[PDB]
RNA sequence: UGACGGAGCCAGCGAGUCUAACCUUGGCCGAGAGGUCUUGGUAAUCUUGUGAAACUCCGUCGUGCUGGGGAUAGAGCAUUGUAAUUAUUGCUCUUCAACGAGGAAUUCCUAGUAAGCGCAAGUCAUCAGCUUGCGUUGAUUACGUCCCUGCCCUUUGUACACA
RNA sequence: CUUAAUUGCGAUAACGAACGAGACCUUAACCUACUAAAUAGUGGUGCUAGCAUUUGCUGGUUAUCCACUUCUUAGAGGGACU
């Protein structure tokens, strides 16, 4: 097709490639899975009772190279809660920033997340040699 | 329902001390001269047809 | 109990037994049926996810389009 | 042929530029296909100048338009206008107008404020109320 | 025409009554529309 | 029909419908002309739309009050109570929903009889709020052909919260039975009996 | 057309350190609150692309005072300030209620405006449930009038002029 | 009689006026036509990694020649004067 970097869809993509990372053997968690509410405004524990850091291989790392240089609190910025703070406005509220800073040192070992100047993190030549050909794989297993 | 196929013949004016009833003429153009002296409720721009039931059952001043 | 319990093992598969004269399977209809609740009602109704009489063409959440179809 | 005329998708919330060149008919919002524009439904008001007077309209043109800033209406019209200016302001200067205007059976037949510049603009909020024309309520003694 | 088709000896009258009235000064301007006049216009006698 | 095939991603399901005939993929936006009588030349139908977004200057000109989309004049006419008002891209998919509930329960591929929503919800006379003094005054005038655009849209749509909110049941399915029920004779519904008090003393007192 | 959880993701206004320490992406730490070296900026340089909420899409919740609500008091951890008790604020858990559309009383407002929601600035060490603006999404129906209330003009009447 | 208007017409012991208001002025604006371009925004591509060969795309390059003024910004002006 001449599959470019930005032919990649957003939800039916992550349904069928981030679920493939569920059984790569990849534990790589800080030991703090299903103890975190994933928002200060959240009142309930999350869904699966194990894992769900496997979204980060197709939601986060796909969105780093949508831009060119990234940090952490802007990737924290997608998780947006609204703590019902008594009788007051429901102000700008993010999650706890420890997980994204420790995914920052968990999926770095693969070669996908590389050390960057011009601030924080940029994508590597594992992007143009695996992440391009999981845009040539996930869209080409879902043609 | 004896449907007198009414029409906006001319643009008569207003009534209503609270400004609610706007005046027109209402009859079918064939067999005129038998028509309620009556108006339309709200918005009507000029000179088109209308569907109704009554034909000639009048009143005069409408507050 | 009285309402919103588990599956009604007594009369379960109304989907393949009672969809003439009522083409209505949703959140908004199946709570006066003296039925299990949407905590576990439509979870017990996604058993026909491959095919079935009731069929969505709308993939959205929280209410689907389930009638007498083929 | 690429002389880039500096046509624009300009509305309430887009300072865009359309470099509508002449190619096969590919289109990228900096890389983006037609299936990714973020409403999932209001995408289908980009119907107007493409598949309603002609089938192809492809080998004549090529689209690659950026958008930066703004909000959430200019993905529908100001995306569309930048693409639509590359057709009738480029098949007019080179291709003839009777070839344009007699085959303009649908470019203007559904012209729901496309190329006419928008005249529905922000106005400053007042003083003494909640909103731009929303006041408080009073009280007496 | 259908009130008096019932009326044989057709319509019989064009029926009209007469009444002559006597108001006063103190009750005329609480029904009848004059209620004031100016200084130098109190001169006519025909009503139109 | 020998379509265009090309490398940049454009699918097939759009070009086999709209390149010659006005329609949508599974919806009908077809050949249905105005089956209902007058109020014709006041309706957005001719020219029908494909999906729902069209705005513009339709503010206070009394004398061009009918070229605006009544598609659009429907799709913002139920929203209130602090969270539904505003936010006006949320009914855009319920016309993708409830024009597939009528289009699955007695199909009538949707544009045939929904243009005919003046056949049943088109009044014949309306009783005024005229002054009088003392009673429930609806000594009346005769009807007007644009009150059948504002009173038509409202009283078939404002009943979508007296039956849905405070409990579990949604908006969509009661916009399907009570569209057909407000397109046929009803006797057990919301439109026709609320189409009574503005016609009750339209014949029992002239 | 709601709530929870995931996917995508939007503004403009600014005001920002001076011989002092303001805005600040990150690195690393710890669950947060946040903390130490660092990233740029006296300013279309950096904050900040203000990807925020409200929003779009896909899984989980059911007729209850409830996965709506968070009043009420209790314990602990931090931040600011020579200085926090009669608690500066937040954070994590204990406390988890009222209240169900609300009486003779009664306001505002006719197109990017009525409406929806949320960020700067203003007081700002710290303290927005406030007030200006900035914006992001946007219907209505009257299409105007004197009974109630308010104001100007003609005519008359007036034993009144701090009227 | 009209009007947002003591605004205008028309009647006229009046005529002609000075005000306020109106007028005037802004703004979110149209100007790819300009004096004009990375402390700011552009088709290009110096060095060109790669998905893909469906042959130019995703690109980056704390500047490589910097390609260029319309988008960003207005010096006066036009364009609209029911």
mmCIF file of N, CA and C in Angstrom, chain F residues 36-139:
data_model
loop_
_atom_site.group_PDB
_atom_site.id
_atom_site.type_symbol
_atom_site.label_atom_id
_atom_site.label_comp_id
_atom_site.label_asym_id
_atom_site.label_seq_id
_atom_site.Cartn_x
_atom_site.Cartn_y
_atom_site.Cartn_z
ATOM 1 N N UNK F 36 -46.934 14.684 1.610
ATOM 2 C CA UNK F 36 -47.862 15.553 2.312
ATOM 3 C C UNK F 36 -48.157 16.785 1.458
ATOM 4 N N UNK F 37 -49.281 17.433 1.761
ATOM 5 C CA UNK F 37 -49.729 18.650 1.097
ATOM 6 C C UNK F 37 -48.963 19.864 1.608
ATOM 7 N N UNK F 38 -49.518 21.059 1.372
ATOM 8 C CA UNK F 38 -48.891 22.360 1.609
ATOM 9 C C UNK F 38 -48.336 22.537 3.019
ATOM 10 N N UNK F 39 -47.491 23.565 3.183
ATOM 11 C CA UNK F 39 -46.209 23.675 3.909
ATOM 12 C C UNK F 39 -45.088 23.231 2.965
ATOM 13 N N UNK F 40 -45.406 22.812 1.740
ATOM 14 C CA UNK F 40 -44.374 22.633 0.726
ATOM 15 C C UNK F 40 -43.888 24.012 0.288
ATOM 16 N N UNK F 41 -42.574 24.118 0.026
ATOM 17 C CA UNK F 41 -41.670 25.279 -0.142
ATOM 18 C C UNK F 41 -41.273 25.880 1.204
ATOM 19 N N UNK F 42 -41.625 25.247 2.323
ATOM 20 C CA UNK F 42 -41.154 25.643 3.643
ATOM 21 C C UNK F 42 -40.281 24.585 4.304
ATOM 22 N N UNK F 43 -39.964 23.501 3.603
ATOM 23 C CA UNK F 43 -39.329 22.331 4.198
ATOM 24 C C UNK F 43 -37.921 22.207 3.628
ATOM 25 N N UNK F 44 -36.973 21.785 4.479
ATOM 26 C CA UNK F 44 -35.619 21.472 4.031
ATOM 27 C C UNK F 44 -35.598 20.344 3.005
ATOM 28 N N UNK F 45 -36.556 19.412 3.074
ATOM 29 C CA UNK F 45 -36.663 18.352 2.073
ATOM 30 C C UNK F 45 -36.959 18.975 0.717
ATOM 31 N N UNK F 46 -36.138 18.622 -0.280
ATOM 32 C CA UNK F 46 -35.741 19.499 -1.391
ATOM 33 C C UNK F 46 -35.151 20.802 -0.838
ATOM 34 N N UNK F 47 -33.959 20.681 -0.242
ATOM 35 C CA UNK F 47 -32.979 19.630 -0.563
ATOM 36 C C UNK F 47 -32.505 18.837 0.658
ATOM 37 N N UNK F 48 -32.610 17.512 0.595
ATOM 38 C CA UNK F 48 -32.289 16.683 1.759
ATOM 39 C C UNK F 48 -30.790 16.591 1.995
ATOM 40 N N UNK F 49 -30.447 16.342 3.254
ATOM 41 C CA UNK F 49 -29.066 16.338 3.706
ATOM 42 C C UNK F 49 -28.668 14.881 3.941
ATOM 43 N N UNK F 50 -27.366 14.642 4.106
ATOM 44 C CA UNK F 50 -26.856 13.283 4.255
ATOM 45 C C UNK F 50 -26.477 12.942 5.694
ATOM 46 N N UNK F 51 -25.702 13.797 6.367
ATOM 47 C CA UNK F 51 -25.568 13.773 7.821
ATOM 48 C C UNK F 51 -25.803 15.191 8.325
ATOM 49 N N UNK F 52 -25.813 15.348 9.647
ATOM 50 C CA UNK F 52 -26.428 16.518 10.276
ATOM 51 C C UNK F 52 -25.393 17.527 10.773
ATOM 52 N N UNK F 53 -25.049 18.497 9.909
ATOM 53 C CA UNK F 53 -24.464 19.770 10.356
ATOM 54 C C UNK F 53 -24.703 20.826 9.275
ATOM 55 N N UNK F 54 -25.544 21.820 9.583
ATOM 56 C CA UNK F 54 -25.722 23.004 8.735
ATOM 57 C C UNK F 54 -26.225 24.168 9.580
ATOM 58 N N UNK F 55 -25.418 25.224 9.677
ATOM 59 C CA UNK F 55 -25.734 26.431 10.436
ATOM 60 C C UNK F 55 -25.670 27.654 9.522
ATOM 61 N N UNK F 56 -26.082 28.801 10.052
ATOM 62 C CA UNK F 56 -26.002 30.031 9.290
ATOM 63 C C UNK F 56 -26.918 31.098 9.856
ATOM 64 N N UNK F 57 -27.065 32.170 9.079
ATOM 65 C CA UNK F 57 -27.888 33.320 9.456
ATOM 66 C C UNK F 57 -29.359 32.939 9.338
ATOM 67 N N UNK F 58 -29.980 32.638 10.472
ATOM 68 C CA UNK F 58 -31.406 32.342 10.528
ATOM 69 C C UNK F 58 -31.995 32.963 11.803
ATOM 70 N N UNK F 59 -31.647 34.226 12.053
ATOM 71 C CA UNK F 59 -31.836 34.804 13.382
ATOM 72 C C UNK F 59 -33.186 35.492 13.540
ATOM 73 N N UNK F 60 -33.471 36.563 12.801
ATOM 74 C CA UNK F 60 -34.684 37.322 13.061
ATOM 75 C C UNK F 60 -35.365 37.857 11.808
ATOM 76 N N UNK F 61 -34.916 37.480 10.610
ATOM 77 C CA UNK F 61 -35.674 37.796 9.398
ATOM 78 C C UNK F 61 -36.981 37.023 9.427
ATOM 79 N N UNK F 62 -38.103 37.745 9.524
ATOM 80 C CA UNK F 62 -39.405 37.076 9.573
ATOM 81 C C UNK F 62 -39.753 36.465 8.226
ATOM 82 N N UNK F 63 -39.173 36.997 7.162
ATOM 83 C CA UNK F 63 -39.692 36.787 5.827
ATOM 84 C C UNK F 63 -38.800 35.856 5.006
ATOM 85 N N UNK F 64 -37.883 35.144 5.663
ATOM 86 C CA UNK F 64 -37.223 33.955 5.127
ATOM 87 C C UNK F 64 -37.067 32.940 6.253
ATOM 88 N N UNK F 65 -38.184 32.598 6.890
ATOM 89 C CA UNK F 65 -38.137 31.752 8.073
ATOM 90 C C UNK F 65 -38.249 30.263 7.776
ATOM 91 N N UNK F 66 -37.952 29.804 6.563
ATOM 92 C CA UNK F 66 -38.239 28.406 6.271
ATOM 93 C C UNK F 66 -37.219 27.690 5.389
ATOM 94 N N UNK F 67 -36.093 28.312 5.043
ATOM 95 C CA UNK F 67 -35.099 27.618 4.231
ATOM 96 C C UNK F 67 -34.054 26.898 5.082
ATOM 97 N N UNK F 68 -33.966 27.236 6.370
ATOM 98 C CA UNK F 68 -33.095 26.552 7.318
ATOM 99 C C UNK F 68 -33.445 25.069 7.412
ATOM 100 N N UNK F 69 -32.451 24.210 7.648
ATOM 101 C CA UNK F 69 -32.740 22.786 7.845
ATOM 102 C C UNK F 69 -33.602 22.462 9.051
ATOM 103 N N UNK F 70 -34.803 21.943 8.778
ATOM 104 C CA UNK F 70 -35.616 21.348 9.831
ATOM 105 C C UNK F 70 -35.061 20.007 10.278
ATOM 106 N N UNK F 71 -34.130 19.432 9.509
ATOM 107 C CA UNK F 71 -33.199 18.449 10.054
ATOM 108 C C UNK F 71 -32.478 19.030 11.263
ATOM 109 N N UNK F 72 -31.868 20.208 11.095
ATOM 110 C CA UNK F 72 -31.099 20.820 12.173
ATOM 111 C C UNK F 72 -32.000 21.386 13.259
ATOM 112 N N UNK F 73 -33.141 21.956 12.870
ATOM 113 C CA UNK F 73 -34.094 22.485 13.840
ATOM 114 C C UNK F 73 -34.729 21.394 14.702
ATOM 115 N N UNK F 74 -34.658 20.126 14.281
ATOM 116 C CA UNK F 74 -34.986 19.008 15.161
ATOM 117 C C UNK F 74 -33.855 18.701 16.137
ATOM 118 N N UNK F 75 -32.610 18.686 15.653
ATOM 119 C CA UNK F 75 -31.503 18.055 16.362
ATOM 120 C C UNK F 75 -30.917 18.910 17.483
ATOM 121 N N UNK F 76 -31.602 19.973 17.908
ATOM 122 C CA UNK F 76 -31.168 20.700 19.096
ATOM 123 C C UNK F 76 -32.356 21.080 19.969
ATOM 124 N N UNK F 77 -33.492 20.401 19.804
ATOM 125 C CA UNK F 77 -34.780 20.825 20.343
ATOM 126 C C UNK F 77 -35.265 19.885 21.435
ATOM 127 N N UNK F 78 -34.344 19.328 22.216
ATOM 128 C CA UNK F 78 -34.713 18.561 23.396
ATOM 129 C C UNK F 78 -33.796 18.812 24.584
ATOM 130 N N UNK F 79 -32.782 19.652 24.429
ATOM 131 C CA UNK F 79 -31.644 19.711 25.332
ATOM 132 C C UNK F 79 -31.854 20.786 26.387
ATOM 133 N N UNK F 80 -31.798 20.397 27.661
ATOM 134 C CA UNK F 80 -32.037 21.321 28.769
ATOM 135 C C UNK F 80 -31.451 20.739 30.053
ATOM 136 N N UNK F 81 -31.676 21.459 31.161
ATOM 137 C CA UNK F 81 -31.373 21.045 32.542
ATOM 138 C C UNK F 81 -29.864 20.966 32.820
ATOM 139 N N UNK F 82 -29.080 21.895 32.266
ATOM 140 C CA UNK F 82 -27.720 22.129 32.717
ATOM 141 C C UNK F 82 -26.642 21.231 32.142
ATOM 142 N N UNK F 83 -26.983 20.043 31.627
ATOM 143 C CA UNK F 83 -25.997 19.159 31.009
ATOM 144 C C UNK F 83 -26.356 18.728 29.595
ATOM 145 N N UNK F 84 -27.642 18.670 29.245
ATOM 146 C CA UNK F 84 -28.023 18.375 27.876
ATOM 147 C C UNK F 84 -27.956 19.594 26.984
ATOM 148 N N UNK F 85 -28.380 20.758 27.479
ATOM 149 C CA UNK F 85 -28.239 22.015 26.756
ATOM 150 C C UNK F 85 -26.769 22.356 26.530
ATOM 151 N N UNK F 86 -26.498 23.025 25.406
ATOM 152 C CA UNK F 86 -25.146 23.028 24.875
ATOM 153 C C UNK F 86 -24.825 21.615 24.413
ATOM 154 N N UNK F 87 -23.519 21.330 24.271
ATOM 155 C CA UNK F 87 -23.007 19.963 24.072
ATOM 156 C C UNK F 87 -23.587 19.345 22.789
ATOM 157 N N UNK F 88 -23.815 20.172 21.766
ATOM 158 C CA UNK F 88 -24.830 19.851 20.766
ATOM 159 C C UNK F 88 -24.316 18.954 19.647
ATOM 160 N N UNK F 89 -23.364 18.072 19.949
ATOM 161 C CA UNK F 89 -22.967 16.984 19.065
ATOM 162 C C UNK F 89 -23.180 15.630 19.746
ATOM 163 N N UNK F 90 -24.338 15.447 20.394
ATOM 164 C CA UNK F 90 -24.663 14.194 21.066
ATOM 165 C C UNK F 90 -25.937 13.531 20.567
ATOM 166 N N UNK F 91 -26.822 14.265 19.898
ATOM 167 C CA UNK F 91 -27.964 13.677 19.215
ATOM 168 C C UNK F 91 -27.641 13.320 17.775
ATOM 169 N N UNK F 92 -26.399 13.559 17.352
ATOM 170 C CA UNK F 92 -25.997 13.344 15.969
ATOM 171 C C UNK F 92 -25.965 11.856 15.639
ATOM 172 N N UNK F 93 -25.745 11.010 16.640
ATOM 173 C CA UNK F 93 -25.777 9.576 16.419
ATOM 174 C C UNK F 93 -27.098 8.927 16.809
ATOM 175 N N UNK F 94 -28.031 9.656 17.421
ATOM 176 C CA UNK F 94 -29.320 9.031 17.682
ATOM 177 C C UNK F 94 -30.204 9.114 16.442
ATOM 178 N N UNK F 95 -29.936 10.057 15.532
ATOM 179 C CA UNK F 95 -30.549 9.977 14.210
ATOM 180 C C UNK F 95 -29.893 8.860 13.401
ATOM 181 N N UNK F 96 -28.664 8.471 13.754
ATOM 182 C CA UNK F 96 -28.087 7.219 13.293
ATOM 183 C C UNK F 96 -28.635 6.023 14.058
ATOM 184 N N UNK F 97 -29.268 6.248 15.213
ATOM 185 C CA UNK F 97 -29.920 5.172 15.954
ATOM 186 C C UNK F 97 -31.398 5.048 15.596
ATOM 187 N N UNK F 98 -32.182 6.109 15.829
ATOM 188 C CA UNK F 98 -33.633 5.953 15.750
ATOM 189 C C UNK F 98 -34.132 6.068 14.315
ATOM 190 N N UNK F 99 -33.255 6.432 13.372
ATOM 191 C CA UNK F 99 -33.642 6.110 11.995
ATOM 192 C C UNK F 99 -33.146 4.770 11.559
ATOM 193 N N UNK F 100 -32.732 3.921 12.496
ATOM 194 C CA UNK F 100 -32.562 2.503 12.244
ATOM 195 C C UNK F 100 -33.411 1.643 13.162
ATOM 196 N N UNK F 101 -34.185 2.242 14.069
ATOM 197 C CA UNK F 101 -35.141 1.453 14.838
ATOM 198 C C UNK F 101 -36.477 1.400 14.107
ATOM 199 N N UNK F 102 -36.923 2.538 13.561
ATOM 200 C CA UNK F 102 -38.050 2.516 12.635
ATOM 201 C C UNK F 102 -37.665 1.790 11.360
ATOM 202 N N UNK F 103 -36.387 1.831 10.988
ATOM 203 C CA UNK F 103 -35.886 1.154 9.805
ATOM 204 C C UNK F 103 -35.512 -0.297 10.097
ATOM 205 N N UNK F 104 -35.836 -0.799 11.287
ATOM 206 C CA UNK F 104 -35.815 -2.233 11.537
ATOM 207 C C UNK F 104 -37.148 -2.747 12.070
ATOM 208 N N UNK F 105 -37.974 -1.892 12.667
ATOM 209 C CA UNK F 105 -39.322 -2.226 13.108
ATOM 210 C C UNK F 105 -40.267 -1.519 12.146
ATOM 211 N N UNK F 106 -40.820 -2.279 11.191
ATOM 212 C CA UNK F 106 -41.633 -1.766 10.078
ATOM 213 C C UNK F 106 -40.855 -0.700 9.300
ATOM 214 N N UNK F 107 -39.879 -1.196 8.521
ATOM 215 C CA UNK F 107 -38.747 -0.477 7.929
ATOM 216 C C UNK F 107 -39.041 0.913 7.371
ATOM 217 N N UNK F 108 -39.899 0.989 6.339
ATOM 218 C CA UNK F 108 -40.297 2.190 5.587
ATOM 219 C C UNK F 108 -39.158 3.182 5.354
ATOM 220 N N UNK F 109 -38.133 2.751 4.567
ATOM 221 C CA UNK F 109 -36.728 3.173 4.466
ATOM 222 C C UNK F 109 -36.632 4.693 4.576
ATOM 223 N N UNK F 110 -35.973 5.225 5.625
ATOM 224 C CA UNK F 110 -36.607 6.196 6.530
ATOM 225 C C UNK F 110 -37.255 7.445 5.941
ATOM 226 N N UNK F 111 -36.794 7.950 4.794
ATOM 227 C CA UNK F 111 -37.248 9.255 4.313
ATOM 228 C C UNK F 111 -38.661 9.227 3.720
ATOM 229 N N UNK F 112 -39.305 8.058 3.622
ATOM 230 C CA UNK F 112 -40.631 7.995 3.002
ATOM 231 C C UNK F 112 -41.691 8.690 3.852
ATOM 232 N N UNK F 113 -41.852 8.265 5.101
ATOM 233 C CA UNK F 113 -42.944 8.750 5.934
ATOM 234 C C UNK F 113 -42.460 9.745 7.005
ATOM 235 N N UNK F 114 -41.150 9.963 7.153
ATOM 236 C CA UNK F 114 -40.735 10.982 8.115
ATOM 237 C C UNK F 114 -40.817 12.384 7.518
ATOM 238 N N UNK F 115 -40.779 12.512 6.188
ATOM 239 C CA UNK F 115 -41.183 13.761 5.546
ATOM 240 C C UNK F 115 -42.683 13.955 5.731
ATOM 241 N N UNK F 116 -43.418 12.851 5.877
ATOM 242 C CA UNK F 116 -44.848 12.847 6.143
ATOM 243 C C UNK F 116 -45.165 12.956 7.627
ATOM 244 N N UNK F 117 -44.290 13.590 8.410
ATOM 245 C CA UNK F 117 -44.569 13.921 9.801
ATOM 246 C C UNK F 117 -45.409 15.187 9.948
ATOM 247 N N UNK F 118 -46.022 15.657 8.859
ATOM 248 C CA UNK F 118 -47.068 16.672 8.908
ATOM 249 C C UNK F 118 -48.439 16.030 8.683
ATOM 250 N N UNK F 119 -48.477 14.739 8.335
ATOM 251 C CA UNK F 119 -49.744 14.054 8.091
ATOM 252 C C UNK F 119 -50.527 13.846 9.382
ATOM 253 N N UNK F 120 -49.843 13.475 10.460
ATOM 254 C CA UNK F 120 -50.500 13.251 11.740
ATOM 255 C C UNK F 120 -50.253 14.386 12.723
ATOM 256 N N UNK F 121 -49.012 14.873 12.819
ATOM 257 C CA UNK F 121 -48.674 15.977 13.710
ATOM 258 C C UNK F 121 -48.797 17.333 13.027
ATOM 259 N N UNK F 122 -49.608 17.425 11.978
ATOM 260 C CA UNK F 122 -49.988 18.693 11.414
ATOM 261 C C UNK F 122 -51.377 19.071 11.880
ATOM 262 N N UNK F 123 -51.473 20.109 12.710
ATOM 263 C CA UNK F 123 -52.778 20.520 13.236
ATOM 264 C C UNK F 123 -53.676 21.119 12.162
ATOM 265 N N UNK F 124 -54.917 21.359 12.559
ATOM 266 C CA UNK F 124 -55.928 21.932 11.686
ATOM 267 C C UNK F 124 -56.411 23.293 12.159
ATOM 268 N N UNK F 125 -56.316 23.570 13.459
ATOM 269 C CA UNK F 125 -56.658 24.857 14.049
ATOM 270 C C UNK F 125 -55.961 24.921 15.401
ATOM 271 N N UNK F 126 -55.633 26.132 15.851
ATOM 272 C CA UNK F 126 -55.014 26.306 17.157
ATOM 273 C C UNK F 126 -55.730 27.383 17.965
ATOM 274 N N UNK F 127 -55.969 27.073 19.233
ATOM 275 C CA UNK F 127 -56.690 27.959 20.133
ATOM 276 C C UNK F 127 -55.723 28.958 20.745
ATOM 277 N N UNK F 128 -56.123 30.227 20.770
ATOM 278 C CA UNK F 128 -55.223 31.289 21.184
ATOM 279 C C UNK F 128 -55.189 31.446 22.697
ATOM 280 N N UNK F 129 -54.233 32.245 23.147
ATOM 281 C CA UNK F 129 -54.264 32.885 24.453
ATOM 282 C C UNK F 129 -54.728 34.319 24.184
ATOM 283 N N UNK F 130 -56.035 34.483 23.997
ATOM 284 C CA UNK F 130 -56.628 35.790 23.775
ATOM 285 C C UNK F 130 -57.172 36.256 25.121
ATOM 286 N N UNK F 131 -57.385 37.566 25.254
ATOM 287 C CA UNK F 131 -57.586 38.138 26.572
ATOM 288 C C UNK F 131 -58.878 37.793 27.281
ATOM 289 N N UNK F 132 -59.994 38.369 26.855
ATOM 290 C CA UNK F 132 -61.284 37.990 27.398
ATOM 291 C C UNK F 132 -61.536 38.433 28.828
ATOM 292 N N UNK F 133 -60.860 37.786 29.775
ATOM 293 C CA UNK F 133 -61.040 38.077 31.183
ATOM 294 C C UNK F 133 -61.936 37.102 31.923
ATOM 295 N N UNK F 134 -61.367 36.339 32.859
ATOM 296 C CA UNK F 134 -62.171 35.561 33.787
ATOM 297 C C UNK F 134 -62.029 34.050 33.748
ATOM 298 N N UNK F 135 -61.914 33.474 32.560
ATOM 299 C CA UNK F 135 -61.973 32.034 32.366
ATOM 300 C C UNK F 135 -60.664 31.519 31.764
ATOM 301 N N UNK F 136 -60.685 30.265 31.314
ATOM 302 C CA UNK F 136 -59.577 29.694 30.549
ATOM 303 C C UNK F 136 -59.771 30.097 29.092
ATOM 304 N N UNK F 137 -59.440 31.358 28.800
ATOM 305 C CA UNK F 137 -59.803 31.987 27.530
ATOM 306 C C UNK F 137 -59.016 31.379 26.377
ATOM 307 N N UNK F 138 -59.694 30.590 25.550
ATOM 308 C CA UNK F 138 -59.157 30.195 24.258
ATOM 309 C C UNK F 138 -60.245 30.269 23.186
ATOM 310 N N UNK F 139 -60.986 31.376 23.195
ATOM 311 C CA UNK F 139 -61.455 31.974 21.953
ATOM 312 C C UNK F 139 -60.263 32.120 21.015
#
